[PDB]
Every structure is written in C-alpha cells, then in structure tokens.
Design a binder for this molecule. Structure first.
Ligand SMILES: CC(=O)Nc1cccnc1
Length: 161
C-alpha cells in the first residue's frame, strides 16, 4: 500500500540530488549517509529543522533515471568514519547526513515527463542542479510514481517524525 508513504510525505520538503556516478549512490544506499557541498549542506540543515520530513530524490547524471529517494534523519555532522566517496578533494565536502531510504528502486525520466517543478521555472522535474528544491505537490507526485519498495517498512521511519 501507499498510505504510510503518503503519511511520511505529508508537508515534506523535497530536494533533487544529482550524483556524477553510481558508486556514490550505491554507497549511500548501503550506509544510509549522504554528503554534499557546503552551499547545499546549509540548505539541507535549514530544511531539516523546518519540516517534518526532508526527502532527497537521487539521480545519477546521464543515467536517464532516478535511483530512489530517502528521508533525512539528522542534520549534517563531522568526524565520522570517512566515507570513500568517488568524487567528480574530500575536504571540500561538508558534513555527513544520516538518511533512511524510502525507495531503492529506479524510475526512468520517461515516466515523470508530466511533472514540472514550480521552483525551477516549471521545467520538467528531472531537470535541475544538485540541491534544487522541488515544490511540495510535484515532489509528492514524483515520489508516488516510484515502484513500491517492498523491502522497506515505513513503520520505522514514521516513529522518527
Ligand atoms: C557524495 C557526493 O557525491 N557529494 C558531492 C560531490 C560533488 C558535488 N557535490 C556533492
């Protein structure tokens, strides 16, 4: 079903995350972490304090697809075990965000072609710089397009809100 998913997404904020390679998204899927440039880290930390759920929607560049989406479970923090990101220097990254995956399945851009993002000139939601915020209605509908991920139990993430 989609009811718990809709509950998690209610009044959420959404951010497009663009990765240059599949290895970084695989690492994020395995370890439940993300790291980004400070301009976006600051935006994500502000959003985390401001909304019940902050959703990151991942897309590997040139892949033609989104690779899933996850919910921020923490503000960024420094001093953890170093994540061996494959970058485009590691000091240039900000802190690390803990994330809880909501869907690890892919969605091709062909399926989201009817969704435009008001915060990026109503261009199709697939188009945007890393860190681009997606307006609430567009972001909710995009997340609802993903195939259900039956390996994830959202009871756990609901208890964090
Ligand atoms: C994990 C990751 O790929 N972070 C990143 C790299 C380059 C630019 N912005 C963010």
């Amino acid at each position: 079903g989609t009811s718990k998913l809709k509950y998690v997404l209610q009044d959420a904020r959404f951010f497009l995350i663009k990765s240059n390679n599949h290895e970084n998204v695989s690492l994020a899927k395995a370890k439940g972490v993300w790291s980004t440039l400070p301009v976006n880290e600051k935006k994500l930390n502000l959003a985390f304090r401001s909304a019940r759920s902050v959703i990151l929607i991942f897309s590997v560049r040139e892949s033609g697809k989104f690779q899933g989406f996850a919910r921020l479970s923490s503000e960024s923090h420094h001093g953890g075990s170093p994540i061996h990101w494959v970058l485009p220097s590691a000091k240039m990254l900000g802190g690390v965000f803990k994330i809880d995956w909501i869907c690890r399945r892919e969605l091709p851009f062909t399926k989201s072609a009817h969704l435009t993002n008001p915060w990026n000139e109503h261009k199709p939601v697939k188009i945007g710089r890393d860190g681009q915020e997606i307006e609430l209605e567009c972001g909710t509908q995009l997340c609802l397009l993903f195939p259900p991920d039956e390996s994830i139990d959202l009871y756990q993430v609901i208890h964090k809100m």
